[PDB]
Amino acid sequence: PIGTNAIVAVISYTGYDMEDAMIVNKASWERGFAHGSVYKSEFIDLSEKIKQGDSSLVFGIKPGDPR
Amino acid sequence: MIIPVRCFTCGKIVGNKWEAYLGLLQAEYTEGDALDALGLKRYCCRRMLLAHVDLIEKLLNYAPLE
Amino acid sequence: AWDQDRFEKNFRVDVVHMDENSLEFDMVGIDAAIANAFRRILLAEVPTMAVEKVLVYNNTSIVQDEILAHRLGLIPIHADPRLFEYRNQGDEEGTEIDTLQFRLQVRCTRNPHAAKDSSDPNELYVNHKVYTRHMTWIPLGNQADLFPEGTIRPVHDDILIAQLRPGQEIDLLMHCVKGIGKDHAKFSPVATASYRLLPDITLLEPVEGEAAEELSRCFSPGVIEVQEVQGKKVARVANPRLDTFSREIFRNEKLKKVVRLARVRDHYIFSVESTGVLPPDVLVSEAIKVLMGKCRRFLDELDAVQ
Amino acid sequence: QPMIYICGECHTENEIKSRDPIRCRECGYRIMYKKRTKRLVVFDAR
Amino acid sequence: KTALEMVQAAGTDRHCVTFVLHEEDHTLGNSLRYMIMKNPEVEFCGYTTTHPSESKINLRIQTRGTLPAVEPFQRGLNELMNVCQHVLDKFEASIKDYKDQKASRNE
Amino acid sequence: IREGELLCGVLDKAHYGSSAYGLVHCCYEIYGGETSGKVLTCLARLFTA
């Protein structure tokens, strides 16, 4: 299923609504009206850049700046 | 996904009627009567059950079960 | 002009029903721009307690953790809002005085000795529908000396939170605070709060003959009592209060003027529906208290500026 | 303590330690996940 | 830490001046006003909400004679609070009435 | 309108509309610009409230 229901009342109660602008109650936007989240999954390979040795990814022995 | 806690329009607690909903289902009421007996009057709370569709009893099958 | 006693002769508050989490009382004799103030103060001002900080240890369920964190907030604590202070600015720790502290932990596993069936998980599982009774209050400092048992608890012990399958577990540690109804929306102590003006159905003609059929169907369930002084049904209003203005009288070209639909000027009817933090009576009282206190603040400020 | 991983197709730990293949030393199939360390983390719920 | 502040009109003084409350809504600025209105010495009394993303209102008060507006203002506050006091009294009285009644009904 | 007090007739599309021989039209010609603009904004506000 693709979308989520809603209650419409069609009045010129604010002026705000014209040329397709619309107002949404702030509470029923806190109560969970169609909250979203996106998964972007970047990808990396260290074989992309040709370097010497057995470069693979790991935190070095060297003390990394302890942040 | 899972049933939301408080209704959207007004604010009632609806995050519990689901189990008793399926209950009064097995007792074979026509849903109009079920949402009545569950005590919901203003319709903006009824369309929260008359049209919910559960997506964890169909999404858990891919569980990394053990 | 204004005069106290002229008014105070008029005001009366008739109650028509109260039970647990319900209230309905006529405020006949006040002017709109005060009733509106009561309703606003209810839906926005009676302070309440709620969850606003969840700490995660090892979430390994399908329900991603951000959404669990926000799905918690709506949960109502069943504790007293009057016995705390607004959390002093910052200080995530705070004091005793500005916090509850709950805890949730439901590590799930299989069913020890299950049959062949695999019909329902309740026979196949244990701890797979994490409810709220798996939450347990924790004390801070002298909370023990302060409160008795059986109070600090969410209000229903039935609000489904998650769903697990063997191998997955959760570990939370909440943080409760105090706030108002306009800083957010998980603070409304009531479902609804409204008022409609008593409708007043005056037959500008005596209706008669066979109109009774369509009249009785022109209105709400029981309004016109068909009355038979001579076995011949006539109509009169049983209760003008029980209607919502169907206005389904006008579609009949004839019965558009033999009746009259209107409103009595000031006959408001509140109706409060509490969640359960407090029963509606203390709610109304607290609303009025905060209005009066606001006005006192303004007045004393005007005084101390001069 | 050390790093842990799980084989995808059969779900049996593999614990990559040395400089070595990336195959589940039992499970022929080969693609890996990571596993969750119990940690503390702040998360608002407004 | 102001919570009430007035800016004195250029045209005249102290029969037309305009107030600036803080931290408010259409609750006070629509009850207080209706209360002031009943007073007959006042000419003009109206309010607005200067800004949606802030919460402060604007109160305008104008009077026939030469007495400043502080007097109608203050008497309005007082009128309203005494009203609410009486209302609360009647409320709780009626509450306990019907409660003890309901108990008496079912005993 | 006679001396700034309308006496009969509606305000239809013509006057507050942007056409020749309108209200905000003529205000601007003989008073300046700023006052015509103020008329427009204030009249709109009344019309919303």
XYZ file of C-alpha atoms in Angstrom:
641
model
C 0.000 0.000 0.000
C 1.253 3.380 -1.014
C -0.214 6.236 1.058
C -1.824 7.137 4.372
C -5.331 8.437 5.080
C -6.239 11.942 6.290
C -9.150 14.195 7.284
C -9.879 17.141 4.957
C -12.037 20.123 5.735
C -12.325 22.446 2.776
C -12.572 26.066 3.940
C -10.801 29.359 3.380
C -10.081 29.622 7.061
C -6.740 31.304 6.855
C -6.170 32.816 3.464
C -2.965 30.768 3.391
C -4.535 28.178 1.109
C -4.533 29.149 -2.556
C -2.521 28.126 -5.598
C -2.250 24.815 -3.827
C -0.869 25.591 -0.420
C -2.385 23.767 2.543
C -2.216 23.761 6.345
C -1.781 20.711 8.574
C -2.645 20.574 12.269
C 0.585 20.485 14.226
C -0.596 17.987 16.810
C -1.653 15.290 14.350
C 1.745 15.885 12.853
C 3.304 15.044 16.173
C 1.080 11.989 16.618
C 2.705 10.375 13.591
C 1.373 11.590 10.229
C 3.477 9.829 7.595
C 6.961 10.097 9.093
C 9.721 9.058 6.739
C 13.278 7.816 6.558
C 15.658 7.115 3.692
C 18.423 4.501 3.384
C 21.387 5.648 1.331
C 24.038 2.943 1.107
C 27.392 4.182 -0.164
C 29.936 1.605 -1.305
C 33.737 1.646 -1.196
C 36.613 -0.504 -2.450
C 40.230 0.283 -1.694
C 41.273 -1.559 -4.837
C 40.023 1.548 -6.639
C 43.365 3.289 -6.110
C 46.396 1.140 -6.936
C 48.910 1.294 -4.087
C 51.825 -0.742 -2.797
C 51.476 -3.566 -0.311
C 48.526 -5.409 1.145
C 46.403 -2.334 1.853
C 43.184 -3.459 3.463
C 41.045 -1.429 5.824
C 41.742 -1.475 9.556
C 42.535 0.881 12.425
C 46.313 0.920 12.521
C 48.469 -0.138 15.436
C 49.531 3.488 15.701
C 47.724 5.372 18.479
C 44.969 7.163 16.631
C 44.075 10.563 17.979
C 41.885 9.266 20.794
C 38.642 10.683 19.547
C 3.928 -1.674 10.337
C 2.763 -2.106 13.890
C -0.352 -0.387 15.290
C 0.229 3.229 16.340
C -0.296 4.274 19.923
C -2.526 7.359 19.913
C -5.078 8.186 17.213
C -4.123 10.738 14.593
C -6.957 13.237 14.570
C -8.064 13.401 18.200
C -5.675 11.615 20.560
C -7.441 8.624 22.081
C -5.478 5.567 23.133
C -5.951 3.036 20.328
C -2.706 1.156 20.805
C -4.479 -1.642 22.630
C -7.758 -2.438 20.871
C -6.019 -4.535 18.224
C -5.918 -7.796 20.160
C -9.501 -7.524 21.342
C -10.297 -6.544 17.770
C -9.144 -9.884 16.416
C -10.950 -11.408 19.369
C -14.338 -9.936 18.528
C -13.485 -10.957 15.003
C -13.389 -14.655 15.854
C -16.810 -14.203 17.480
C -18.048 -13.168 14.035
C -19.366 -9.642 14.146
C -19.695 -7.517 11.042
C -16.922 -5.023 11.646
C -19.362 -2.185 12.227
C -20.500 -4.011 15.325
C -16.954 -4.841 16.393
C -15.773 -1.249 16.389
C -18.964 -0.374 18.250
C -18.470 -2.937 21.007
C -14.862 -1.822 21.307
C -16.137 1.622 22.231
C -15.171 4.004 19.439
C -17.676 6.648 18.447
C -16.241 9.515 16.413
C -15.341 8.077 13.021
C -11.880 9.666 12.872
C -10.891 6.980 15.342
C -12.671 4.159 13.551
C -10.768 4.512 10.309
C -7.711 3.730 12.393
C -8.765 0.095 12.693
C -11.223 -0.476 9.871
C -8.262 0.076 7.554
C -5.011 -0.922 9.225
C -2.858 -3.536 7.534
C -0.214 -5.342 9.517
C 3.326 -5.598 8.229
C 5.246 -7.437 10.859
C 3.393 -10.746 10.682
C 4.355 -10.704 6.967
C 7.828 -9.275 7.415
C 9.177 -11.432 10.202
C 9.339 -14.521 7.980
C 12.727 -13.274 6.728
C 13.888 -13.430 10.336
C 17.512 -14.406 10.826
C 16.011 -17.025 13.102
C 18.136 -19.493 15.025
C -22.411 47.683 32.421
C -20.731 45.019 34.537
C -22.136 44.065 37.919
C -21.116 41.065 40.005
C -24.396 40.164 41.667
C -26.626 40.508 38.617
C -24.452 37.827 37.056
C -23.969 35.590 40.084
C -27.738 35.314 40.337
C -27.744 33.500 36.972
C -24.786 31.079 36.866
C -25.470 27.388 37.407
C -23.541 24.204 36.626
C -25.741 21.169 36.038
C -24.037 17.773 35.694
C -25.672 15.124 33.524
C -23.178 12.265 33.794
C -19.828 11.378 35.295
C -18.123 8.006 35.404
C -14.461 7.081 35.231
C -12.774 9.054 32.426
C -15.869 11.043 31.439
C -17.722 14.224 32.361
C -20.597 16.296 31.009
C -21.899 19.464 32.618
C -23.930 22.465 31.506
C -22.306 25.865 31.981
C -25.471 27.881 31.379
C -24.902 31.585 31.837
C -21.379 32.462 30.722
C -20.237 34.348 27.646
C -18.500 32.620 24.741
C -15.116 34.269 25.147
C -14.675 32.552 28.502
C -15.874 29.071 27.586
C -13.427 29.153 24.714
C -10.760 30.060 27.259
C -11.583 27.007 29.364
C -11.407 24.640 26.401
C -8.116 26.128 25.250
C -6.582 25.938 28.701
C -7.560 22.276 28.926
C -6.162 21.176 25.599
C -2.965 23.081 26.161
C -2.116 23.914 29.764
C -2.765 21.261 32.437
C 0.814 20.027 32.917
C 1.637 16.323 32.780
C 4.637 13.964 33.002
C 6.042 11.985 30.114
C 9.042 10.224 28.616
C 11.577 12.336 26.798
C 14.908 10.513 26.886
C 15.536 6.899 26.005
C 18.953 5.300 26.248
C 19.697 2.268 24.114
C 21.619 -0.852 25.051
C 21.748 -3.425 22.283
C 18.632 -3.091 20.117
C 18.490 -6.100 17.788
C 14.872 -6.133 16.617
C 13.232 -5.324 13.301
C 11.861 -2.080 14.716
C 14.653 0.399 14.123
C 15.635 2.227 17.275
C 14.812 5.838 16.404
C 11.229 4.768 15.848
C 11.065 2.809 19.070
C 12.387 5.855 20.898
C 9.675 8.062 19.461
C 7.002 5.364 19.851
C 7.741 5.388 23.556
C 7.054 9.067 24.138
C 3.330 8.714 23.655
C 3.175 6.372 26.650
C 1.348 7.931 29.637
C 2.929 7.777 33.087
C 0.307 7.350 35.820
C 1.894 9.621 38.413
C 1.105 12.917 40.075
C 1.998 16.051 38.088
C 1.598 18.399 41.066
C 4.461 16.951 43.113
C 7.397 17.961 40.911
C 9.214 20.976 39.509
C 9.909 21.987 35.941
C 13.259 20.492 35.089
C 15.855 23.149 35.791
C 17.455 24.244 32.567
C 19.757 21.508 31.322
C 21.340 19.158 33.866
C 20.400 15.890 32.205
C 20.857 14.256 35.610
C 18.831 16.792 37.540
C 17.631 16.004 41.032
C 15.188 13.593 42.528
C 12.526 16.273 42.172
C 12.433 16.359 38.377
C 12.441 12.761 37.214
C 11.089 9.302 37.154
C 13.286 6.491 35.856
C 11.967 3.326 34.237
C 13.622 0.236 32.763
C 12.857 -2.365 30.072
C 14.595 -5.684 29.382
C 12.964 -8.620 27.606
C 15.633 -10.952 26.163
C 13.666 -13.594 24.263
C 14.278 -17.285 23.569
C 12.502 -20.359 22.213
C 9.878 -22.541 23.894
C 11.582 -25.149 26.108
C 9.362 -28.143 25.309
C 7.037 -27.416 22.407
C 4.789 -29.928 20.669
C 4.697 -30.879 16.981
C 2.006 -28.402 16.025
C 3.651 -25.017 15.398
C 0.146 -23.569 15.161
C 0.357 -20.459 17.336
C 3.535 -18.855 18.681
C 2.124 -18.598 22.209
C 2.678 -22.350 22.395
C 5.916 -21.949 20.442
C 7.339 -18.944 22.219
C 7.848 -16.903 25.363
C 8.378 -13.122 25.395
C 7.480 -12.443 21.782
C 4.915 -9.648 22.270
C 6.752 -7.144 24.427
C 4.025 -5.386 26.393
C 4.366 -2.601 28.958
C 4.028 -4.714 32.105
C 7.607 -5.658 31.271
C 8.427 -2.130 32.347
C 9.244 -1.695 36.013
C 9.679 1.447 38.081
C 13.073 2.240 39.588
C 13.534 4.544 42.592
C 15.866 7.538 42.762
C 17.187 8.462 46.172
C 14.211 8.757 48.529
C 11.415 7.961 46.099
C 10.785 4.925 48.283
C 10.212 7.093 51.356
C 8.084 9.341 49.173
C 5.614 7.118 47.353
C 3.713 3.934 48.204
C 3.498 0.842 46.031
C 1.294 0.306 43.007
C 1.320 3.905 41.820
C 4.271 4.432 39.506
C 3.254 2.528 36.402
C 2.056 3.107 32.861
C -1.677 3.326 32.703
C -2.809 0.224 30.866
C -0.260 -2.627 30.951
C -1.629 -3.526 27.505
C 0.045 -1.199 24.996
C 1.918 -3.333 22.486
C 5.410 -2.009 21.836
C 7.375 -4.433 19.686
C 7.558 -7.999 18.453
C 10.505 -10.361 18.709
C 11.737 -13.702 17.435
C 14.129 -15.949 19.311
C 17.570 -14.391 19.546
C 16.659 -10.696 19.806
C 16.478 -8.445 22.835
C 16.100 -4.858 23.993
C 17.543 -2.770 26.819
C 16.183 0.679 27.598
C 16.510 3.113 30.467
C 13.992 5.934 30.242
C 14.041 9.410 31.781
C 10.798 11.115 32.759
C 10.232 14.866 33.030
C 7.500 17.486 33.484
C 5.981 19.776 30.882
C 2.901 21.422 29.405
C 0.491 20.676 26.602
C 1.677 23.305 24.115
C 5.392 22.512 24.213
C 4.520 19.244 22.507
C 1.616 16.935 21.874
C 2.420 14.073 24.237
C 1.034 16.127 27.102
C -2.699 16.575 26.385
C -4.309 15.198 29.533
C -7.555 14.692 27.633
C -8.734 13.079 24.448
C -11.380 15.683 23.642
C -12.741 18.917 25.089
C -15.537 20.741 23.320
C -18.885 22.473 23.681
C -22.028 22.706 21.607
C -24.854 25.138 22.242
C -28.135 23.594 23.256
C -30.372 23.385 20.161
C -33.936 24.620 20.613
C -36.662 23.140 18.410
C -39.763 25.337 18.342
C -42.676 24.266 16.171
C -43.837 27.518 14.592
C -46.931 25.444 13.767
C -48.561 22.470 15.455
C -47.529 19.501 13.318
C -50.184 16.887 12.811
C -51.850 14.459 10.418
C -49.290 11.960 9.159
C -46.218 14.224 9.307
C -45.173 12.178 12.332
C -43.562 9.525 10.126
C -41.259 11.873 8.228
C -40.659 14.210 11.158
C -39.560 11.326 13.377
C -37.258 10.435 10.497
C -36.361 14.078 9.893
C -34.557 14.216 13.211
C -32.215 12.481 15.647
C -33.208 9.092 17.172
C -35.534 10.160 19.958
C -36.642 13.765 19.687
C -40.239 13.958 18.578
C -42.482 11.790 20.702
C -45.485 10.839 18.616
C -48.274 11.562 21.070
C -51.826 10.287 20.696
C -54.223 12.349 22.767
C -57.001 10.752 20.696
C -55.154 7.734 19.333
C -54.090 10.136 16.561
C -50.362 10.745 16.765
C -49.205 14.332 17.241
C -45.627 15.500 17.708
C -43.873 17.264 20.555
C -40.205 17.390 21.480
C -38.970 14.737 23.907
C -35.521 16.256 24.317
C -34.272 19.197 22.253
C -30.796 18.463 23.638
C -30.423 15.176 21.741
C -29.722 16.395 18.233
C -26.749 17.333 16.067
C -28.609 19.499 13.540
C -29.145 16.988 10.781
C -30.850 19.887 8.985
C -32.577 17.169 6.993
C -35.833 19.102 7.314
C -35.218 21.455 4.389
C -35.241 18.847 1.632
C -39.008 18.664 1.963
C -40.397 21.761 0.231
C -43.351 21.802 2.646
C -41.774 21.193 6.059
C -39.321 24.059 5.711
C -41.410 26.627 7.591
C -43.684 24.572 9.878
C -40.721 24.214 12.260
C -37.774 26.301 13.414
C -34.178 25.263 14.063
C -31.874 27.549 16.016
C -29.669 27.840 19.081
C -30.299 29.079 22.596
C -27.874 31.961 23.092
C -25.583 30.772 25.915
C -26.212 27.200 27.045
C -22.800 25.631 26.527
C -22.158 21.952 27.261
C -18.628 20.882 27.978
C -17.550 17.238 27.813
C -14.113 16.155 29.038
C -12.422 12.820 28.274
C -9.363 12.150 30.367
C -6.583 9.816 29.355
C -6.120 8.584 32.897
C -3.440 10.770 34.429
C -6.212 12.313 36.570
C -9.999 11.974 36.598
C -11.717 14.843 34.762
C -12.844 16.723 37.890
C -9.345 17.564 39.083
C -8.704 18.512 35.463
C -11.376 21.201 35.329
C -10.310 22.504 38.724
C -6.662 22.720 37.676
C -7.524 24.523 34.455
C -9.381 27.224 36.353
C -6.537 27.465 38.856
C -3.989 28.150 36.157
C -6.137 30.828 34.522
C -6.504 32.635 37.831
C -2.799 32.284 38.562
C -1.834 33.738 35.203
C -4.001 36.772 35.867
C -2.529 37.183 39.347
C 0.919 37.169 37.765
C 0.043 39.942 35.348
C -1.629 42.073 38.006
C 1.175 41.801 40.543
C 3.613 42.680 37.775
C 1.636 45.817 36.940
C 1.696 46.587 40.652
C 5.432 46.126 41.168
C 6.255 48.220 38.101
C 4.576 51.265 39.681
C 36.498 -9.292 22.833
C 37.769 -9.376 19.232
C 35.933 -8.727 15.975
C 32.980 -11.003 15.165
C 31.118 -11.654 11.926
C 28.355 -13.947 10.694
C 28.026 -15.912 7.508
C 25.025 -14.883 5.501
C 23.436 -18.034 4.202
C 23.770 -20.247 7.279
C 24.297 -17.814 10.201
C 27.365 -19.267 11.964
C 30.051 -16.997 13.420
C 33.343 -16.597 11.560
C 35.537 -14.159 13.562
C 37.956 -12.782 10.978
C 41.234 -12.342 12.865
C 44.295 -12.842 10.674
C 45.160 -11.879 7.084
C 43.113 -14.477 5.365
C 40.171 -15.491 3.147
C 36.714 -14.019 3.564
C 34.889 -17.347 3.483
C 32.988 -18.973 6.334
C 35.415 -21.680 7.443
C 32.486 -24.072 7.456
C 29.817 -22.470 5.296
C 30.941 -22.458 1.684
C 28.932 -19.343 0.844
C 30.715 -16.067 1.433
C 29.339 -12.666 2.321
C 29.538 -11.199 5.789
C 27.727 -8.962 8.290
C 28.839 -7.367 11.533
C 27.582 -7.903 15.078
C 26.340 -5.518 17.720
C 28.382 -4.493 20.755
C 26.333 -3.492 23.791
C 26.920 0.252 24.052
C 25.349 3.351 25.581
C 23.972 6.058 23.329
C 21.767 9.098 23.829
C 18.597 9.366 21.752
C 15.916 12.004 22.142
C 12.260 11.137 21.626
C 10.498 14.428 20.951
C 12.711 39.481 32.362
C 9.776 41.627 31.295
C 6.290 40.148 31.322
C 4.351 43.402 30.769
C 5.503 46.583 29.065
C 3.851 49.638 27.514
C 5.042 51.994 24.777
C 3.707 55.503 25.189
C 1.881 56.863 22.156
C 3.322 59.848 20.327
C -0.053 61.462 19.588
C -1.122 61.867 23.210
C -0.406 60.215 26.541
C -2.418 58.124 28.968
C -5.739 57.921 27.346
C -4.853 55.908 24.214
C -1.657 53.996 25.011
C -0.964 50.428 23.843
C 0.302 47.461 25.871
C 2.638 44.624 25.004
C 2.119 41.471 27.026
C 4.491 38.560 26.645
C 4.100 34.805 26.316
C 0.448 34.530 25.401
C -2.266 33.390 23.015
C -5.892 34.037 22.145
C -6.889 32.988 25.672
C -6.133 36.060 27.705
C -6.147 38.507 24.808
C -9.716 37.384 24.125
C -11.064 37.063 27.647
C -9.424 40.128 29.197
C -10.600 42.246 26.303
C -14.221 41.160 26.587
C -13.930 41.990 30.260
C -12.545 45.505 29.745
C -15.289 46.180 27.196
C -18.063 46.290 29.799
C -16.447 49.361 31.398
C -18.268 52.389 29.914
C -15.523 55.018 30.143
C -13.405 53.368 27.457
C -13.626 54.313 23.796
C -11.496 51.770 21.944
C -10.242 48.365 23.090
C -8.770 45.799 20.714
C -5.975 43.271 20.428
C -3.771 41.554 17.874
C -1.006 38.933 17.806
C 2.096 40.606 16.462
C 3.797 37.517 15.250
C 2.929 33.843 14.681
C 6.384 32.410 15.483
C 6.436 34.426 18.695
C 3.879 34.397 21.459
C 3.387 38.028 22.446
C 0.212 40.021 21.858
C -0.687 43.694 21.548
C -3.389 45.434 23.562
C -4.909 48.768 22.548
C -7.011 50.820 24.965
C -8.564 54.263 24.483
C -10.648 56.342 26.857
C -12.949 59.344 26.689
C -11.811 61.394 29.663
C -8.337 62.273 30.809
C -7.706 59.454 33.278
C -5.027 57.076 31.995
C -5.904 53.557 30.884
C -4.121 51.881 33.789
C -7.349 52.188 35.748
C -9.656 50.303 33.326
C -6.871 47.804 32.751
C -6.469 46.977 36.423
C -10.180 46.939 37.153
C -10.606 44.485 34.285
C -8.026 42.095 35.700
C -9.791 42.265 39.044
C -13.259 41.712 37.587
C -12.123 38.616 35.721
C -10.364 37.019 38.654
C -13.296 37.489 41.012
C -15.485 35.922 38.326
C -13.287 32.841 38.080
C -13.193 32.536 41.845
C -16.963 32.390 42.095
C -17.148 29.952 39.200
C -14.661 27.578 40.819
C -16.586 27.694 44.083
C -19.847 26.756 42.406
C -18.041 24.092 40.405
C -16.517 22.154 43.288
C -19.674 22.545 45.344
C -21.709 20.931 42.566
C -19.071 18.231 42.067
C -19.160 16.991 45.634
C -22.942 17.329 45.604
C -23.435 14.924 42.731
C -20.691 12.612 43.968
C -22.238 12.107 47.400
C -25.604 11.852 45.665
C -24.412 9.140 43.272
C -23.034 7.243 46.249
C -26.352 7.684 48.064
C -28.260 6.480 45.005
C -26.532 3.078 44.958
C -26.448 2.275 48.681
C -18.468 56.683 -2.717
C -18.897 60.290 -1.608
C -16.208 61.720 0.688
C -14.800 58.341 1.631
C -18.000 56.695 2.904
C -19.380 54.102 0.506
C -23.130 54.554 0.234
C -24.508 51.919 -2.124
C -23.183 48.995 -4.110
C -20.785 46.096 -3.637
C -17.059 45.966 -4.160
C -16.789 43.619 -7.142
C -13.806 42.517 -9.236
C -13.392 45.914 -10.864
C -12.138 48.155 -8.102
C -9.762 46.198 -5.912
C -8.935 44.290 -9.054
C -6.151 45.509 -11.289
C -8.120 47.259 -14.041
C -8.575 50.793 -15.246
C -10.942 52.834 -13.107
C -10.494 50.962 -9.860
C -10.234 51.941 -6.245
C -6.595 51.131 -5.585
C -6.173 52.290 -9.179
C -7.223 55.886 -8.614
C -5.899 56.136 -5.059
C -2.395 55.801 -6.411
C -2.771 58.434 -9.107
C -3.615 61.309 -6.778
C -2.164 60.371 -3.383
C 1.181 58.812 -4.241
C 2.219 55.199 -4.119
C 2.813 54.264 -0.515
C -0.747 55.059 0.510
C -2.186 52.932 -2.293
C -0.019 50.015 -1.181
C -1.103 50.462 2.416
C -4.721 50.469 1.291
C -4.183 47.196 -0.532
C -2.540 45.354 2.349
C -4.913 46.567 5.049
C -7.996 45.879 2.980
C -6.743 42.365 2.349
C -6.205 41.799 6.057
C -9.719 42.868 6.918
C -10.974 40.618 4.168
C -9.246 37.606 5.693
C -10.193 38.283 9.312
